Curated annotation (Swiss-Prot), chain D:
Belongs to the hemocyanin family. This is Arylphorin. Hemolymph. Coiled coil: none annotated. It comes from the Eukaryota. It is found in: Secreted. It comes from Galleria mellonella. The chain holds residues 603 to 694 of 702 of the full protein. Larval storage protein (LSP) which may serve as a store of amino acids for synthesis of adult proteins. Binds the A.niger cell wall component alpha-1,3-glucan, a fungal pathogen-associated molecular pattern (PAMP) that activates the host immune response.
Length: 678, 678, 50, 92, 50, 101
C-alpha cells in the first residue's frame, strides 16, 4: 500500500481567536489525566461555580447544575455514556453550564473545574460539544474525534501494543519491532493496524470491515450527533431551520444506510436484513473494543432479544411502532398537541422528531419527568449487555451502541435504522409524486454525461493515538512520545463529471449529481420505483447556462457533500503558528470524507448509476440566509428523490440523465496485506 | 476486614538443589518478556537442538520436535491454550523435549532456547510442567499459579489499574491513590480487588464469587491438571498407581463439585443445574477477564448451543454419552481392546479414563492420527466463542474454559462435570454395597464427637502480580516495582475434632473425617442414600487404640486433605537464602487450601454433618517411601462413600458417628466493603 | 359510591396501595429465604413458574 | 368488626435467622393537618389528608432530599427462635 | 392445628427535639436492605419496597 | 390430559397442552430413552448378534421373544447375565416422562 500525501486546504484564522484556539486545545490534551503542574489545574481546583452564579446568562441552568452536583456526580475512572440516564442528566447539566457561561474566561474556568473535579469522559464529551456550539468559539478547529477518543477507533490488539510500549518506555529489542508491525522514529512509534476479521463479524460481513470501522465514517456519525443532540430544542440547534430537523434526521440516516448498502453490494452481501423483535437475532457481533476498564459486550449468534427481563423494553418498542402505524391510518391528527397533516411533505419534521424522541417532539406539552426513547430502548435490547447492567446505575458493560463513536461498527445499527426508515418510507407514500411539469425544465437538454475512470484503492493513513495512553509525570511536564496508528483506508482517484447541455436561453440553474446502485443482491436491475431511496446525493451547485451548447466540468474534489480528511493534531499546531486553520475541519466537518465517495471496486467493475438533474434556480428565503453555504436553494433535501417515484417515465426528462458507471479497484484487493513480509 | 499473616510451614531444601532452584526461578521471572542482557539470552539464542540430538534420551522426541519446528511454531504475542489443537501439538512436543533432556544443563539450555525463540505462553506452560515431572528438579518450589499468570486470576478493572500505574511510572497525584483503592509503600503498589458482581454472574450466583474466583480454588485445579495431564501415559505419571488414574479423576471432580455445592447451599442457590445439549442454555457468563490482546468470550443468557456450525461437535458429544449408556447395558464388554467388568469396582479406572479421553484409554489400540475429546468438545460448545474462532488455526477468542487457570470461574464448568459424574454415578449402581460385616469394627465404639466452634471470616490476602506488567529495560536490568493485589479471602478459625472411642483391644486403626450437607435447596434433610456423593473427605490417618477409653484430639491444621496457603515469591526468595522451602507447596500442592474447608457461615448458622469412621488398619504395600503420606491404606479413595449406600441402617455402626455442626460467620458477611470511605 | 362513598375518588389509590403492600411483603419473605426478586415474564414465551 | 381489613400482626416481620436478617426501619415526622370535613366519617381509617403511602407514594429521584432532620433510617435485624422450619410436627 | 409465623412484641422508641409545641403525624415503614444479589438497595430503587 | 382421578389423598397429575418433555431435569431420562431406541435400530442393522449374552437371529421368527423382552426390560432379558444392581426400564422411564408429574 502507498502512503497518503495531500496538500491541505487552509485559510487564515481571525487573530482575535488565536488565544481561544490555544486554550481549547490545551484543555483537550491528555484529558484522561490531570497534571497538577498545568495551568488549568490551579484555576479549576479553586473555581467555585456557586460563587460565580452571575457569570452565567441563565440562572436556572446554574441552579439545576448545583442541585445535581450536591447529590454527587459519577466518580472519575468510570465508563461514561450519554445512554446511561443518571450520567446523561449530569452531563447535560454540565454542557448547559458550559454553554451559558457569559464569556470565554468564564467558560474556560468552568471547563477547568470540570476537568479537575469530574469524570473524564463526561468532561471531554461536554467540552467538545460546547466548543461546537458556543458563539465565541465558532471558527476554531477541534481535533478529529478519533484523535480525542482513539480507544474507540481501533481494536484491542492494536491498543495492547501501544500500552505495552508505554509500559516499557520503548521496545526492549528494537530490531524486533518491524516483525510485529511496530516502527520507531524520533520519539514516535508507528503501529500498523488491521480491521476486524471473521472473529468479530459473521456471514462474511468481515469483508467490509475496512468500511464500517473506518475512522472517518465513524467520525461522521459522531459529528452529526454533536451537531444535533436529541436533548436540545431545535431553536438552539438550527434556528430558522428548526422546522427541518426531522427532515435532516431522515436525510442523514437514509444516506448512511444507502452508502452502507453500496458497500454490501460491492462485497456480495446483498440487502440489509429485516428482523422480528420476538425471534432469535441472527446477526452476531464480537467487538475487539474495550473501554480500558471493561470489555465491550458481545452478542452471540441467535441471541434472544425478548427475555422476561427485557419485556418492558420490548413492549415499549412494539407500542411505539404500533402507534406510528395507527398515525398512518389516521392521516391527519393531533399528537403531543401538534397538528400533523401527513399529506403535506412538511410533516417529515414531526415524523423525524417522533422516531428520534427528541426535545422538539415534546415541546408543546408540559415538561415531563416521564420519558422513554425508542432508539435508546432499541439500542439497549440489541446491545446484549447483561440485564443487571441496566438495573444498577453504577455498573455497566459498555456496548458499541452506547457510543456515537462506535455505533456504525455494529451491523445491528444498520438493521435498527433500516427498520425505522422502513416506517418513514411508508409515511412517504402519503406524498404526492412530483408532476412532469414540476420535473421538466423546458429549453434545457442534457445531451451527454462523461465520467473519468472510477478507481478505488487502499492506502496507509497515519493518525495520532497518544490520547489513549497514560503518560508519566516526567512526560506530562515535558513533551510526550507519539503513538501513531498506521491503517489502510479506502480512497478514490480524483475524477471529473462532464455534463454536456444545450440550452435555448441563458439561465441560472441548479445542478445535482446523485450516485446509486444498479443491481440488487440477486443480480437484478433495480427499477426507479424501488431505487429512489438508494440514491446518494453527491453534489449541489448553481451554474449559469448560455444559449447554445454548454459544458460543465465538475470535479469530485468540489462535490458539495464531501470534505477533505481531517488533519492531525501536529498539523493543527503547525498551521496555528502561521495563523491558519484547516478550512474543511472548521466549516464543513459535517460532510462525508471524500475518500468514501465510491464503494471499493470489484473485479467485475462494480456497476453504479450516476443521476444528473438540472432545474431552475430560486434563491433560499431571506430567513435562511444566515446559513447559505449549507443550503444552495429552497428545495427539499434530497430533491427530487425525497418522495416516491411511482411512474418512472416521469423521470425521462431532457434535463435529467442516468449514466451507467463502473468502479475499479487498483492494487491489492484486501486491506490486510500489511505484514513485514508484505 | 483484617489483614492476613500466617507462619508458613518450612523444611530444608536439599543442598544439591539450590543451584537448580535458583535457575528455575530466574527463568520464570517476567516470562512475558525477553531481556537480552540476561544470562539465558545468549545461551538460548545460540543453542541448536539438532546439534544436541544425542543429549536427549529419546531420539523420536527430538525428531518429532524438529518436524513441527520446521513447519513453524506459533508466533510470540499470541494467545496460547492447550485446547487449540495445533498449539497443543507444539507445546506437548516442546514438553517432551524438556522432559527427555538427559541432565539439568541440557534441560536449562533447551528452556533458554524456548524462552528466546518461542511463544511466551507455550514456554511457561511447558517449563512449569517439566519442573513438576522431571526427577532432577522434583523437590524444589515453584511460584503459585496466580503469581505466574496473574492476568488469569483477577478482573480487568484491577488489571487496568496496574497497567496504568506501570504506564505512568507511579501515581501522578499519590495522595489520590487510596480513593481509587491504591496504596503505595517503598516502590510497591497495593491494589484492592473485588470479586465479580451481578454483571458477570446471573441468578444471584454473584453471591459466591468470592469462592469460585478464589485464587487457591482455581490454583488447585491448575495443579491437578499439571500433575495428571490428560495427554500423558499413566506409567510416566503415577507408576504403580496407574490402574487408579480413573479413580483419581472421579475423586477429584466429585470433591470439586461437592465443595461448590456446599457454597451454593450456604448462599441459598440450591442444587447444580442439569441441562439439555439441544435446548437454550440458561446460565449466562460475562467474564471481566482478558488475555491482554483480546477479551474473553461472553455467553449471553439462553445461548443456543446446537447451531448448524456446531453440529459435528454436538453429534460427537451425544454419541459419547449414548455409547456410555450402552456400555452400562452391556455390563461386561471389550472397549478399545480393554476387557471391562463393571461389576468390579476396579473398572472405575476405565470409566474415569473414558470420560477424560486420556492417553490410557487408547494405550491398547494402535497409535491414532484420529482423536476427539469429549471434554474439549464440550468446553468449546459451552464457551460461546464465535464459530470462526474454531475454524481458523491462527485466530481465537479465548474463553474461561480454554485455561485450567480460569475454568472454575464459569458456572458451566460445574454443570459440565455434574453431567459426567451423573453418568459415572449410574455406573456406580453396578457395585455391591458394603455389608454390615465389612463396615462394623467389632470391639470398637465411638462414644462421642465434639467440635470447637466453626467460624468463617474474610481477611485481606496479598499476592504478587508483577509478572502481569511489561517492564522497561531499566527495570529489567536493575529491579522492578512490585504490583501487589490485596484481596479479601474466605478463611476459618482453627478448630479441633475430639473423638471419644471405647476399644476392647489394643489395635492400630484408620480414622477418617468427612464433611457434608444436611439440607438440600428445598430445606429438606438429605437422606444418606442421596447424600453419600455429597460428603467431602477431610482427614485420613492411623492411630493406636489402647484398651478402654481413648480420646483423639485432631486439629484442622493436621487434616490430610488440606494444605497451607501458597507463599508469595518474595517469601520464597527469603526462605531460599536460609535454605528453606514451603513444605506444603513442594509436597502437598495437590490438596485443597485449608482456608476453604468450611463454606461461608450464614446468619442462620449453616447446618452441616460431620461423619467420623474408625476401621481396622491394613498396611498398604508401600510402593515407595513417599506413598504413605499420600496413600494411608489399601481402601478405595473416598471409602466408605465410594459407592452407593442402598440401606442406611448398614451405616448405624458403633465405629461410625454422625454429628450435626453449624458454621458461624464473624465480621462482615460480604467481601466488597473495602472502599476508602468504609 | 356504594363502596366508599366520599372516598370514591381514592379508589384507584387504594388499589395501588394494597397490591404494592402485598407484593412488597411477599418480596421481604423471598429475600428472607434467598429467593431474590419477583420474576418478570413475556406473555408469548414459556412460563417458567410451575 | 372494625379492622378486619388490616394485615395480621403476626406477619409484620419476615421469618428471621438466628444471627439476624437485615432490614431498614424508616421513621418520619411531619405536621398534622386534619382530614377536611368531606371525609370526617372514616377518620379511624385515615389519619391525615396525605396520599396513602406518603412520603413513598411517588419516585424518590434525589435521596439527599430525604436527609431531613425529621426523618430517620435505622438498620434492624430479625432473629429467629426455635425451629427454623415449620414441618417438624411429627409424633416422633 | 397448623404452625404459623409470629413475632415477639416489640416497642419503637423515637427521640425528637422540637423547637415549638405542635401536633404532628408519625409514620413507621419497614423495608429491605439488600437485594437478592447481596447488594444494598439504594433509596431511588427501594422506595416501592417500603 | 386432565384426569378427574385421584388417589383420595392426592390428585392425579395433569398434563397441559404442548408439554415440553425434554427439560434439564428430565435429560438423563430422555437420554436413556433415546439410547434404548438407537440400540434397537443398531440391532436391526446387525441382524445376527449377541445381546445380554443371548444369541439372537432376527431372520428367525422365534426372535420375537428376545425382541418383546427387550422392549419390556423384563427379567428374562437379563437372565443370562449376573444379577445386577443397575437397572433402568424403557417403559417406566417413558411413563415418567409422559406423566408430567
Ligand atoms: C494483518 O492481517 C494479516 C493477515 O492475517 C497479517 O499477515 C500475516 O502476517 C504474518 C506475520 O505476523 C505473516 O507470517 C509470516 O510469513 C512469512 C512469509 O511466509 C510466506 O512465505 C513462506 C515461504 O517463504 C511460506 O512458508 C508461508 O506459508 C508464506 O507463504 C513467514 O516466513 C514467517 O514465518 C516465520 O515466523 C513464524 C512465526 O510468526 C514461524 O512460524 C516460522 O517458522 C518463521 O520463523 C522464522 O522466522 C522467525 C522470525 O520471524 C524466526 O524466529 C525462526 O527461527 C524462523 O527463522 C511468518 O509466518 C503472514 O504471512 C501474513 N499473512 C498474510 C496472508 O499475509 C498481518 O500480519 C496483520 N497485520 C497486523 C498489523 O496485524
Ligand atoms: C501526537 O499528539 C501529541 C499530543 O497533542 C502531540 O504533542 C504535542 O505537540 C505540540 C506541538 O508540537 C506540543 O506543544 C508544544 O509544547 C511545548 C511544551 O513543552 C514544555 O516543555 C518545554 C521544555 O521542558 C518548556 O520549555 C515548555 O514551556 C513546556 O512547558 C510548548 O513550549 C510549545 O510552544 C509552542 O507553542 C506556543 C503557543 O502556540 C508558541 O508561543 C511557542 O513559541 C511554540 O511555538 C508547544 O505548545 C504539545 O506539548 C505536545 N503534547 C504532548 C502531550 O506531548 C504530538 O506532536 C503528536 N505527534 C504526531 C507525530 O503527530
Ligand atoms: C468493591 O465494591 C464496593 C461496592 O460496590 C465498593 O464500595 C463503594 O465504593 C465507593 C467509592 O468508589 C463508595 O462511594 C462513596 O460513598 C460515600 C458514602 O456514600 C453514602 O453516603 C453519602 C452521604 O450521606 C450519600 O451521598 C451516598 O449516596 C451514600 O449513601 C460518599 O461520601 C462518596 O461520595 C464522594 O465521592 C464522590 C466521587 O467518588 C463524589 O461525587 C461525591 O460528591 C463525594 O465527594 C462515595 O460515593 C461506596 O459507598 C461504596 N459502596 C459500598 C461500600 O457499599 C468498593 O470501592 C469496591 N472496591 C474496589 C477495590 O473496587
Ligand atoms: C514481586 O515479584 C517481583 C518479581 O518476581 C519481586 O522482585 C524480585 O525480587 C528478588 C528478591 O529481591 C530479586 O532478586 C534480586 O536481584 C537483584 C538484582 O539482580 C540482586 O541484587 C539480589 O541479590 C537478588 O538476586 C529479583 O531481581 C526481583 N525481580 C524483579 C523483576 O524485580 C518482588 O520482590 C516481589 N514483591 C513482593 C512484595 O513480593
Ligand atoms: Cl485564560
Ligand atoms: Cl519488545
Ligand atoms: Cl534449532
Ligand atoms: Cl494517578
Ligand atoms: Cl489512578
Ligand atoms: Cl488422592
Ligand atoms: Cl459391539
Ligand atoms: Cl490423546
Ligand atoms: Cu447469524
Ligand atoms: Cu439465565
Ligand atoms: Cu421452572
Ligand atoms: Mg447500569
Ligand atoms: Mg482458532
Amino acid at each position: 500500500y502507498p502512503q497518503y500525501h495531500y496538500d491541505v486546504e487552509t485559510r487564515k484564522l481571525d487573530p482575535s481567536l488565536l488565544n481561544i484556539q490555544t486554550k481549547v486545545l490545551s484543555l483537550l490534551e491528555n484529558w484522561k489525566q490531570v497534571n497538577p503542574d498545568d495551568e488549568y489545574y490551579k484555576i479549576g481546583k479553586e473555581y467555585n461555580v456557586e460563587a460565580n452564579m452571575e457569570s452565567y446568562t441563565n440562572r436556572e441552568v446554574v441552579t439545576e447544575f448545583l442541585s445535581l452536583y450536591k447529590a454527587g456526580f459519577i466518580p472519575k475512572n468510570e465508563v461514561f455514556s450519554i445512554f446511561y440516564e443518571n450520567q446523561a442528566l449530569e452531563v447535560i447539566a454540565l454542557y448547559r453550564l458550559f454553554y451559558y457561561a457569559k464569556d470565554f474566561e468564564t467558560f474556560y474556568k468552568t471547563a477547568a473545574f470540570a476537568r479537575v473535579w469530574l469524570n473524564e469522559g463526561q468532561f471531554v464529551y461536554a467540552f467538545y460539544l460546547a466548543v461546537i456550539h458556543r458563539a465565541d468559539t465558532r471558527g476554531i478547529v477541534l481535533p478529529a474525534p478519533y484523535e480525542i477518543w482513539p480507544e474507540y477507533f481501533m481494536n484491542s490488539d492494536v491498543l495492547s501494543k501501544i500500552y505495552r510500549i508505554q509500559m516499557q518506555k520503548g521496545l526492549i529489542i528494537p530490531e524486533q519491532g518491524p516483525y510485529y508491525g511496530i516502527l520507531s522514529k524520533d520519539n514516535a512509534y508507528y503501529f500498523y493496524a488491521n480491521y476486524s476479521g471473521p472473529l468479530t463479524y459473521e456471514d462474511n460481513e468481515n469483508l467490509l470491515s475496512y468500511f464500517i470501522e473506518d475512522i472517518g465514517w465513524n467520525s461522521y456519525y459522531y459529528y452529526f450527533h454533536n451537531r444535533f443532540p436529541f436533548w436540545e430544542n431545535g431553536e438552539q440547534l438550527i434556528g430558522p431551520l428548526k422546522e427541518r430537523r426531522g427532515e435532516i434526521y431522515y436525510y442523514v440516516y437514509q444516506k448512511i444506510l444507502a452508502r452502507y448498502y453500496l458497500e454490501r453490494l460491492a462485497n456480495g452481501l446483498g440487502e440489509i436484513p429485516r428482523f422480528n423483535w420476538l425471534d432469535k437475532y441472527q446477526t452476531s457481533y464480537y467487538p475487539l473494543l474495550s473501554s480500558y476498564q471493561l470489555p465491550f459486550a458481545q452478542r452471540n449468534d441467535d441471541y434472544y432479544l425478548a427475555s422476561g427481563d427485557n419485556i418492558n423494553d420490548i413492549q415499549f418498542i412494539d407500542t411505539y411502532e404500533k402507534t406510528f402505524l395507527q398515525l398512518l391510518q389516521k392521516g391527519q391528527f393531533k399528537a403531543y398537541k401538534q397538528e400533523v397533516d401527513l399529506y403535506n411533505s412538511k410533516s417529515i419534521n414531526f415524523v423525524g422528531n417522533y422516531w428520534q424522541s427528541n426535545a422538539d417532539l415534546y415541546e408543546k406539552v408540559p415538561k415531563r419527568n416521564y420519558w422513554r426513547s425508542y432508539e435508546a430502548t432499541a439500542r439497549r435490547v440489541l446491545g446484549a449487555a447483561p440485564r443487571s447492567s441496566i438495573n444498577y446505575e453504577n455498573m455497566n458493560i459498555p456496548t458499541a451502541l452506547d457510543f456515537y463513536q462506535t455505533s456504525l461498527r455494529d451491523p445491528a445499527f444498520y438493521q435498527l435504522y433500516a427498520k425505522i426508515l422502513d416506517y418513514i418510507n411508508e409515511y412517504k407514500e402519503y406524498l404526492e409524486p412530483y408532476s412532469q411539469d414540476v420535473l421538466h425544465y423546458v429549453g434545457v437538454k442534457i445531451n451527454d454525461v462523461k465520467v473519468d475512470k472510477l478507481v478505488t484503492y487502499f492506502e496507509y493513513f497515519d493518525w495520532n493515538a497518544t490520547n489513549a495512553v497514560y503518560l508519566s509525570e516526567q512526560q506530562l511536564d515535558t513533551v510526550s512520545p507519539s503513538y501513531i496508528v498506521r491503517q489502510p483506508r479506502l480512497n478514490n482517484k480524483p475524477f471529473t463529471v462532464n455534463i454536456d447541455i444545450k440550452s435555448d436561453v441563458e439561465s441560472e440553474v441548479v445542478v445535482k449529481i446523485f450516485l446509486g446502485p444498479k443491481y440488487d443482491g440477486n443480480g437484478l436491475p433495480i427499477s426507479l420505483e424501488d431505487n429512489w431511496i438508494n440514491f446518494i446525493e453527491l453534489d449541489w451547485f448553481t451554474h449559469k447556462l448560455t444559449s447554445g451548447q454548454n459544458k460543465i466540468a465538475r470535479k469530485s474534489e468540489e462535490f458539495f457533500f464531501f470534505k477533505d480528511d481531517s488533519v492531525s493534531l501536529f498539523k493543527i499546531y503547525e498551521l496555528l503558528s502561521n495563523g491558519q486553520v484547516p478550512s474543511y475541519m472548521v466549516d464543513r466537518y459535517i460532510y462525508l470524507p471524500r475518500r468514501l465517495i465510491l464503494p471499493r471496486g470489484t473485479q467485475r467493475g462494480f456497476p453504479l448509476q450516476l443521476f444528473v438533474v438540472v432545474y431552475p434556480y430560486q434563491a433560499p428565503v431571506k430567513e435562511w440566509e444566515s446559513m447559505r453555504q449549507y443550503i444552495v436553494d429552497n428545495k427539499p433535501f434530497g430533491y427530487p428523490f425525497d418522495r416516491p417515484v411511482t411512474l418512472p417515465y416521469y423521470f425521462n426528462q431532457p434535463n435529467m440523465y442516468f449514466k451507467d458507471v463502473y468502479v475499479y479497484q487498483e492494487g491489492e484487493q484486501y486491506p490486510y496485506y500489511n505484514s513485514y513480509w508484505s
